[PDB]
């Protein structure tokens, strides 16, 4: 044993100073806005048009927040172009399976035919929170006893919509990538769900315009413009929207508590990029449901040494059984197994949506340090001789990526409560 004053107690990770980090997902998450129709399957462009007709407040677009490093008139004109080409589709008595767009100057520019440190903004934890929540709709339809329980917990979870939204768009995009390598294809962003009252529903989030896609390599990059409905005023959090031009396209009527108010509908527009592999990873996002199912299953095994049984039944049904799912100003927050199912799904999904080299760094190394911290929590004596190295390997990955940043922050919170 060593004298306590020599014992090394892990310090918090240092997060860099800088401007607040910005959104860098492939599609809107909590800010997304669906235009939806109840189904009678349809071809996307027909469903898209139908979904857009359920909105009755469209108006002439205008820019409400410039993109700093872009030609903003080109983004407005790209939107008017989308609408003009949807009109043409209409005028055609036959709706086509696909639509190639005119390769105008606005489109060539937009489809083009960062190591500065950022601090952690709060939008990011808000995202995570919203992914853990339950929607009024189900996004999956049909060990096995436990599957259905788990499934019953996450079916309506916001992170599962994100899984589905992401398998559809990545498959549409990878599909267009192969079929129409040179054309600029107009891809509606669509998901399907079931309501409380049991109907099939088709949801339009907006539109991707695929750029050139000669993907001879996995790492080969295809650019795209994303155009996404939202009710989020971009003025609430300008830093979140650094990469975006935001237009105002519509007037949406919402019954608030005090009554019916009119609020702007916005279009979030940006250029973004993706690769064959990244598209393939997004098509594989259902693995997120499987991975978080495995984690919850080990958690039933680690409580199967309570008896000869496993008590999966009571494990899922014993609302008394609680797990630390979070934190408050007071202290660690405890939650039901449901909330654990969704939190672990949301983590898994968010590792997918925010995949990055920084995460691959942060995870391989933060893991080693979590072990040390756990050993210490347990008053074991783990060797700390390599902590210098370890902090270095971890903090190198703490630059500007919002997800990595939130994770570093989560670790420091945990560490504070674990050893203190």
Q: If you search the block for the tokens 């939130």, which residue do you land on?
A: 406
Which pair of tokens denotes residue 261? 């108010």
CB atoms near residue 9 (< 10 Å): 12
Considering all CA atoms of the chain, what is the largest pairwise distance in Å, rounded to the nearest integer?
84
User: Domain for residue 375, yes or no?
Assistant: yes
Side-chain half-sphere CA neighbours of 238 within 13 A: 7
CB atoms near residue 364 (< 10 Å): 12
Contact 75, 245 (CB under 8 A): yes
User: Domain for residue 404, yes or no?
Assistant: yes
Cα–Cα distance between 137 and 172 in angstroms, integer? 23
User: Domain for residue 6, yes or no?
Assistant: no
288 and 140 belong to one structural domain: yes
Out of 252, 282, 312, pick the residue that ends a domain.
282
Contact 371, 392 (CB under 8 A): no
Cα–Cα distance between 137 and 192 in angstroms, integer? 10
86 and 202 belong to one structural domain: yes
76 and 208 belong to one structural domain: yes
Out of 282, 306, 330, pick the residue that ends a domain.
282
Give per-residue burial for 71-110: e unless 16+ CB within 10 Å, then b: ebebbbbbbebbeebbeebeeeeebeebbebeeeebbebb
- Which is it for the CA torsion 12, 335, 32, 273, positive or negative? positive
Cα–Cα distance between 376 and 10 in angstroms, integer? 9
Cα–Cα distance between 132 and 343 in angstroms, integer? 5
Cα–Cα distance between 180 and 177 in angstroms, integer? 6
Cα–Cα distance between 228 and 213 in angstroms, integer? 22
Cα–Cα distance between 373 and 417 in angstroms, integer? 11
39 and 94 belong to one structural domain: yes
188 and 273 belong to one structural domain: yes
Cα–Cα distance between 13 and 412 in angstroms, integer? 6
Cα–Cα distance between 23 and 406 in angstroms, integer? 13
184-194 and 58-65 beta bridge pairing: unpaired
Out of 218, 251, 282, pick the residue that ends a domain.
282
The 3-state secondary structure of 231-270, one letter per residue: CCCCCCCHHHHCCCEEEEEEEEEEECCCCEEEEEEEEEEE
CA neighbor of 265 nearest in space, from 58, 50, 13, 9: 58
Residues forming a β-bridge with 261:
254
307 and 385 belong to one structural domain: yes
176 and 211 belong to one structural domain: yes
Residues 6+ apart with CB under 8 A from 55: 35, 250, 252, 265
296 and 393 belong to one structural domain: yes
The 3-state secondary structure of the chain, one letter per residue: CCCCCCCCCCCCCCCCCCCECCCCCCCCCCCCCCEEEECCCCCHHHHHHHHHCCCCCEEEEEEEECCCCCCHHHHHHHHHHHHHHHHHHHHCCCCCCCCEECCCHHHHHHCCCCCCCCECCCHHHHHHHHHHCECCCECCCCCHHHHHHHHHHHCCEHHHHHHHHHHHHHHHHHHHHHHCCCCEEEEEEEEEEECCCCCEEEEEEEEEEECCCCCCCCCCEEEEEEEEEECCCCCCCHHHHCCCEEEEEEEEEEECCCCEEEEEEEEEEEEEEEEHHHHHHHHCCCHHHHHHHHHHHHHHHCCCCCCCCCCHHHHHHCCCCCEEEEECCCCEEEECHHHHHHHHHHHHHHHHHCCCHHHHHHHHHHHHHHHHHHHHHCCCCCCCCCHHHHHHHHHCCCCCCHHHHHHHHHHHHHHHHHCC
Resolution, rounded to a tenth of an Å?
2.3
245-255 and 58-65 beta bridge pairing: antiparallel
Phi, psi (rounded to 5 degrees) for 59: -145, 175
- Which is it for the CA torsion 66, 68, 71, 77, positive or negative? negative
Cα–Cα distance between 368 and 394 in angstroms, integer? 10
234 and 163 belong to one structural domain: no
Cα–Cα distance between 14 and 370 in angstroms, integer? 16
Residue ranges making up the domain that contains 211: 26-113+168-282
- The total number of structural domains in the chain stands at 2
Kindly give the interhelix angle for 357-377 and 387-395, rounded to the nearest 10 degrees: 140
260-275 and 221-230 beta bridge pairing: antiparallel
Cα–Cα distance between 269 and 247 in angstroms, integer? 8
183 and 160 belong to one structural domain: no
Residues forming a β-bridge with 209:
186, 225
Residues forming a β-bridge with 215:
none
Contact 189, 210 (CB under 8 A): no
């Amino acid at each position: 044993s060593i004298e306590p004053f020599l014992r090394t107690t892990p310090r918090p990770l240092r997060l860099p100073d800088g401007p607040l980090c910005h959104q860098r997902s492939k599609f809107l998450l909590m800010d997304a806005l669906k235009l939806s129709i109840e189904d009678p399957e349809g071809i996307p462009l027909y469903d898209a048009i139908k979904c857009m007709k359920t909105f009755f407040g469209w108006k002439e677009p205008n820019i409400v927040k410039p993109h700093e490093k872009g030609i903003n008139p080109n983004y407005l004109m790209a939107w008017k172009q989308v609408l003009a080409e949807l009109q043409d589709i209409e005028n055609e008595e036959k709706i086509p399976r696909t639509k190639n767009m005119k390769r105008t100057s606005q489109l060539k520019w937009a489809l083009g035919e960062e190591p500065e440190p950022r601090s952690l903004a709060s939008w990011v934890q808000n995202e995570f929170n919203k992914a853990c929540e339950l929607t009024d709709s189900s996004w999956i339809e049909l060990a096995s006893m436990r599957r259905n329980y788990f499934t019953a917990e996450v079916s309506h979870c916001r992170a599962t919509e994100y899984i589905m939204k992401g398998v559809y768009i990545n498959t549409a995009l990878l599909n267009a990538s192969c079929a129409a390598m040179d054309d600029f294809q107009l891809i509606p962003m669509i998901s399907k769900c079931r309501t409380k009252e049991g109907r099939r529903k088709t949801n339009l989030y907006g539109f991707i315009i695929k750029g050139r896609s000669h993907l001879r390599n996995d790492t080969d990059v295809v650019n795209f413009v994303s155009m996404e409905f939202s009710l989020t005023d971009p003025r609430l959090e300008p830093h979140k929207w650094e990469k975006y031009c935001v237009l105002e396209i519509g007037d949406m009527l919402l019954r608030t508590a005090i009554g019916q108010v009119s609020r702007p509908m916005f279009l979030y527009v940006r250029t973004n990029g993706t690769s064959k592999i990244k598209m393939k990873w997004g098509m594989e996002m259902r693995r997120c449901l499987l991975q978080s199912l495995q984690q919850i299953e080990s958690m039933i095994e680690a409580e199967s040494s309570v008896k000869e049984k496993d008590m999966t039944k009571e494990f899922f049904e014993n609302k008394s059984e609680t797990w630390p799912i979070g934190e408050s100003p007071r202290g660690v927050e405890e939650g039901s197994i449901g909330k654990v199912c969704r939190t672990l799904l949301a983590k898994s999904v968010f590792n997918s949506l925010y995949a990055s080299p920084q995460l691959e760094g942060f995870s391989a190394e933060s893991r080693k340090l979590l072990l040390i911290v756990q050993a210490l929590r347990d008053n074991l004596e783990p060797g700390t001789f390599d902590l210098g190295g370890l902090y270095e390997a971890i903090e190198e990955c703490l630059i500007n990526d919002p997800w990595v940043l939130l994770n570093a922050s989560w670790f420091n919170s945990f560490l504070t409560h674990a050893l203190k």
